[PDB]
Design a protein around this ligand. Structure first.
Ligand SMILES: OC[C@H]1O[C@H](O[C@H]2[C@H](O)[C@@H](O)[C@@H](O)O[C@@H]2CO)[C@H](O)[C@@H](O)[C@@H]1O
Lengths: 466, 370, 466
């Protein structure tokens, strides 16, 4: 009913139905507002399943788009007044919730949480970073391939001739952390993104330029319950992509667009709760509950499999490389930023939580968050102890005992394989089905293949004169 | 909004609420509207809370510094006396109750702290804060003390802090600059240091409150106290032989009390506004109404010219006016509540030795220009 | 509270938190106005220390941003109403004030002044100069390097073909001192800078074109207490940089962008005071107190170490070279403008002070001012006599006794080394810690190395045919 009044209040002409595919990309279809009736909400609208990658095959194409009336929000970019309504994908007749629908999967995972009685709500606070460029060009054909990035902030443009003169105040390599404008050219745009994000229901905590030259930026938003947060991530990306477009830029959430400067990560802060109390505060290490520790143990035990969802691109592994600040060591600490799991030191026990640092923004919200949870729960159910916190150092020196302690997957294939083998913790509660998992893996292997099979420019530098 | 077809009044516990009740009595005997007088603790704090909900008293009495904040939160009704009624009061008193040019209360009396001394322990009061330590030394030898006053309320200590230059908000071209505060400047630091030294050196104790100071002077144990007109009644009653005079100087400058205009505001939430106005303008704000109140607890200098005329001639009143003249009328801006709580912490922390003067005043400064 | 009212009065949407790094560069991060609450002021906001150069390392990343409510001022450039609030960097929990935070260091120095009881306030009146260009291009790679400057005022453009014709009224080399427009092309811009500076709390005394061709300019502002003045310098630079940007120009505070014409200096006028009286007026030389003389002696004794903060760039030493007007002779005088310390001849003893001429605008406000003070105090505490004033001549003829009298450092390395050895006067009162000093030196040595190791264009002219 709230929806039917929003239609009149904003004189809506269209309703934009949205959903996410397996890869994590928001999709949409539009219907005139006059097509929204009572039926619409109880039985949804029909659409072809076979069209989305990794979904229904040759025989069972048709499926249901079920509008979730709680998600109604006005689109701030479209020319004609239109209302966005996120939808779940349900199996026809049964109206159950498609095994391969990432939002259904995430909901199932929140259900299973309540079911085990371990807690009643999961809290996710992801920190996606991104880049804002002016020009992005790439291609690949039989005779070669290339990628060219360009932005007014790129340090390389210190020598570029410009029509009205080079005004040259640019962030150097790894020198983007906070120079005030004009070095930072994105203040106005970061704020528009903030205002718009809030007009769309998100709550913004801060915004700032990130480390890399050439437009790395970040908008920090307040956490929320798992599934609602993944929804927020999708909106977040949408706002970022579109505000950038409107400003004459182009944004990307790729994890490592440039060799030699910062990649973009999506740290995930998590905590559990029951009847308003934070199940993660306690007397143990850094203010943690023993529940938190088991959770951590779970995440560490299933890290490589989580990688397949939290770092789902070959590019993801160009960020997760033996570097200093590389969040690749499977350990926890409240200081050592070598550890992929940081423990925020905060006063109020109400805010005690863990920060899993290896995820990147390419990750499917839904599936990434879900896999993080399931690993945590399995860590609890099986009281998987974390061991002791690493407070020493990262991957380089150490190099004492060859420092072969836990680490995240080193390639996408490896992560996919881990997901293959270590799938039980995900199938728990019937959240993830084998079919879903196998389909996801197949989609990504096809991607992994393109990169493995196509000659790399660097290979010419290294081996042309062989 | 509640209320009724009656009148409920809230006034501070140190004022003559029984005189006020005698005035409700002939309001009621002459009208049928019964008046109820209460004096809740923290009323100045309790008001915004209950009035916000549309309830509380029909009429609220406090010094005018709290009224700008009440008005900005929308808790008071704009009053409208005509130029004839307005004419009966000193004009600087209507100015004190103006917020954004509108009148938001009726001014009742002009309050300023004075030095009160026991004529029998000290026929001649000290003219300087600086000779107080010596003086204490001498009395103490005789089982007495030179001075005791409320250290828990910043209002009692502000005259010394302001003497050599401390200030709340700079008054600059028709208005108060909220970012220009003088709680941590060199005069303010000299003033608090002097106070802390009094304590350090055992001339005073960090815990003295209103009651301890009052019992001390009233029983003859201390030769001086600093208080307002409302304390005179109990003194009379104890028969001490007391004088009321100008506060001592510090560094050769006058002590500068913040001056308060006792004021009566009407709850925006009252059904009784017209009753309320009748009461104030025609019962209380007369020579007769003011005198019923003043016989209970003295008011100080009254804003009603006619009564004020009979009031002082009284040397106690003349001294009140002289300290008032050396002082400064408080701002009524919403920011007065931040100022007071910041200065309250600062003094207590500094007197208690929890923080140094420099550290205390600096925190206060930061807190306020929050 | 004043802040919370400024938020409503100006309908502020954002709060821009600012601070300075070790090098002296203003940094910032933004939060929505709605994130400003009571907590904010008492406990500040948390941020990653490890991100700023020369700050926390591998283990102790997190630190506190403490808003200083006295600094609140509206940003005149941002599109959405935003309030700027300068912050100090405090150690978490202890909330002390980071050893490496330049603003904390400057505050500590003002404290120590009051503590020694020598005076209760320090007065700084710096005169930063700057350049306004149209085009600035530069680069360096394995195959070469270059820098190209361009401005409509550059004398070299007397021959340039312009689209709408060359209107040719340009300041010749060293000929910028006051030709009225159109020779001086920056009147309107210098005034906007003035108006804006004042809207931001600065008080302007004058503005004028400086000596060099190609846009050297200067905005003179009224002195203020040391730490508040360094704040003003940061704002000053911000206004200059941004007004220039808005006018289609690009400003630089580099000390010597061009060989052959004036560099940009930042003379520093100083004086001490107690209870409103000027501790520098007296019956001694030129109206000075003996305290002033000891101060001067201190500055002269520790000049080379001060250089490391007042001339922190290799470029700084391209301005401080055996030239005529080069403020390099460590001496005082009321006339001889060869002397790095001028004594302004003024009537009112209330305005008696000293002018240390060798500083340049690249200097960190905070650290430069602080080092100047500490050297002065050590000159007092130890009654270091100045000797007699130099009223003869500069570096050239003289050349009698080879004229080896005191001089400022001749290179950055030399200055850094002096700072290394002569650090005691800075550690006094616990103002500067060894760690801070060593970190600063390390940051600059890395910079010094780039310049020492990269072939210079002139080296080709001089040695290609060797
Ligand atoms: O101590 C702060 C306090 O000062 C003033 O309160 C006075 C009041 O004006 C007098 O009438 C008398 O009652 O005593 C009070 C001090 O106990 C301000 O009026 C008040 O707002 C402030 O909190």
């Amino acid at each position: 009913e709230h929806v039917l009044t929003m239609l009149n209040e904003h004189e809506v002409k269209f309703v934009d139905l949205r959903f996410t595919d397996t890869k994590g990309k928001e999709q949409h279809v539009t219907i005139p507002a006059h097509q929204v009736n009572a039926e619409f909400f109880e039985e949804g609208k029909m659409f072809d399943g076979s069209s989305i990658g990794g979904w229904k095959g040759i025989n069972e194409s048709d499926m249901v788009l079920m509008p979730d009336a709680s998600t109604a929000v006005i689109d701030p970019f479209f020319a004609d007044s239109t209302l966005i309504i996120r939808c779940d994908i349900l199996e026809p007749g049964t109206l159950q919730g498609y095994d391969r629908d990432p939002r259904s999967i995430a909901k199932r995972a929140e259900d299973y949480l309540r079911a085990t009685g371990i807690a009643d709500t999961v809290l996710f606070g992801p920190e996606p970073e991104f880049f804002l460029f002016d020009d992005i060009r790439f291609g690949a054909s039989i005779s070669g391939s290339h990628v060219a990035i360009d932005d007014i902030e790129g340090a390389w443009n210190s020598s570029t001739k410009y029509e009205g003169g080079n005004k040259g105040h640019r962030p150097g390599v790894k020198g983007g952390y906070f120079p005030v404008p004009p070095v930072d050219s994105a203040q106005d745009i970061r704020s528009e993104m903030c205002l718009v994000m809030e007009q769309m229901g998100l709550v913004v905590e801060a915004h700032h330029h990130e480390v890399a030259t050439a437009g790395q930026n970040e908008v920090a938003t307040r956490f929320n319950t798992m599934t609602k947060k993944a929804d927020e991530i999708q909106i977040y990306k949408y706002v970022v992509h579109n505000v950038a477009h409107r400003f004459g830029k182009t944004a990307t959430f790729m994890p490592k667009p440039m060799f030699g400067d910062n990649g973009s990560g999506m740290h995930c802060h998590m905590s559990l709760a029951k009847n308003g109390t934070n199940l993660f505060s306690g007397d143990k290490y850094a203010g943690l509950s023993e529940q938190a520790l088991y959770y951590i143990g779970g995440v560490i035990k299933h890290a490589k499999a989580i990688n397949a969802l939290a770092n789902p691109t070959t590019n993801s592994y160009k960020r997760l490389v033996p570097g200093y600040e590389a969040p690749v060591m499977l350990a926890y600490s409240a200081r050592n930023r070598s550890a992929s799991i940081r423990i925020p030191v905060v006063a109020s026990p109400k805010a005690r939580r863990i920060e899993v640092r290896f995820p990147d923004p390419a990750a499917n919200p839904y599936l990434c968050f879900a896999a993080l949870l399931m690993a945590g729960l399995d860590g609890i159910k099986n009281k998987i102890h974390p061991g002791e916190p690493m407070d020493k150092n990262l991957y380089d020196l150490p190099p004492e005992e060859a420092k072969e302690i836990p680490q995240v997957a080193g390639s996408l294939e490896e992560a996919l394989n881990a997901l293959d083998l270590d799938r039980e913790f995900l199938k728990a509660g019937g959240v993830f089905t084998d079919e879903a998992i196998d389909a996801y893996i197949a989609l990504r292997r096809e991607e992994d293949d393109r990169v493995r099979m196509t000659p790399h420019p660097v290979e010419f530098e290294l081996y042309y004169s062989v | 909004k509640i209320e009724e077809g009656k009148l409920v009044i809230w006034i501070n516990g140190d004022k003559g609420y029984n005189g006020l009740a005698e005035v409700g009595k002939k309001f009621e005997k002459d009208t049928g509207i019964k008046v109820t007088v209460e004096h809740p603790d923290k009323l100045e704090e309790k008001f915004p809370q209950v009035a916000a909900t549309g309830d509380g008293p029909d009429i609220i009495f406090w010094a005018h510094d709290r009224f700008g904040g009440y008005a900005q939160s929308g808790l008071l009704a704009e009053i409208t006396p005509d130029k004839a009624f307005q004419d009966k009061l000193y004009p600087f008193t209507w100015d004190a109750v103006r917020y954004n040019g509108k009148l938001i209360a009726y001014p009742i009396a002009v309050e300023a702290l004075s030095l009160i001394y026991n004529k029998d322990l000290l026929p001649n009061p000290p003219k300087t804060w600086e000779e107080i330590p010596a003086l204490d030394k001498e009395l103490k030898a005789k089982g007495k003390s030179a001075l005791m006053f409320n250290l828990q309320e910043p209002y009692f200590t502000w005259p010394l802090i302001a003497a050599d230059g401390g200030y709340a908000f700079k008054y600059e071209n028709g208005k108060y600059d909220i970012k220009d505060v003088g709680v941590d400047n060199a005069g303010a630091k000299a003033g608090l240091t002097f106070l802390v030294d009094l304590i350090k050196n055992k001339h005073m104790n960090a815990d003295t409150d209103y009651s301890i100071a009052e019992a001390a002077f009233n029983k003859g144990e201390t030769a001086m106290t600093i208080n307002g007109p409302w304390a005179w009644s109990n003194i009379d009653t104890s028969k001490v032989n007391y004088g009321v005079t100008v506060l001592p100087t510090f560094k050769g400058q006058p002590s500068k009390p913040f001056v308060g205009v006792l004021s009566a505001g009407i709850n925006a939430a009252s059904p009784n506004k017209e009753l309320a106005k009748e009461f104030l303008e025609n019962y209380l704000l007369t020579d007769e109404g003011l005198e019923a109140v003043n016989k209970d607890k003295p008011l100080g200098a009254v804003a009603l010219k006619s009564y004020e005329e009979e009031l002082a001639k009284d040397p106690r009143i003349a001294a009140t006016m002289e300290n008032a003249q050396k002082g400064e009328i408080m701002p009524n801006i919403p920011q007065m509540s931040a100022f007071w709580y910041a200065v309250r912490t600062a003094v207590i922390n500094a007197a208690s030795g929890r923080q140094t003067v420099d550290e205390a005043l600096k925190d206060a400064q930061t807190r306020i220009t929050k």
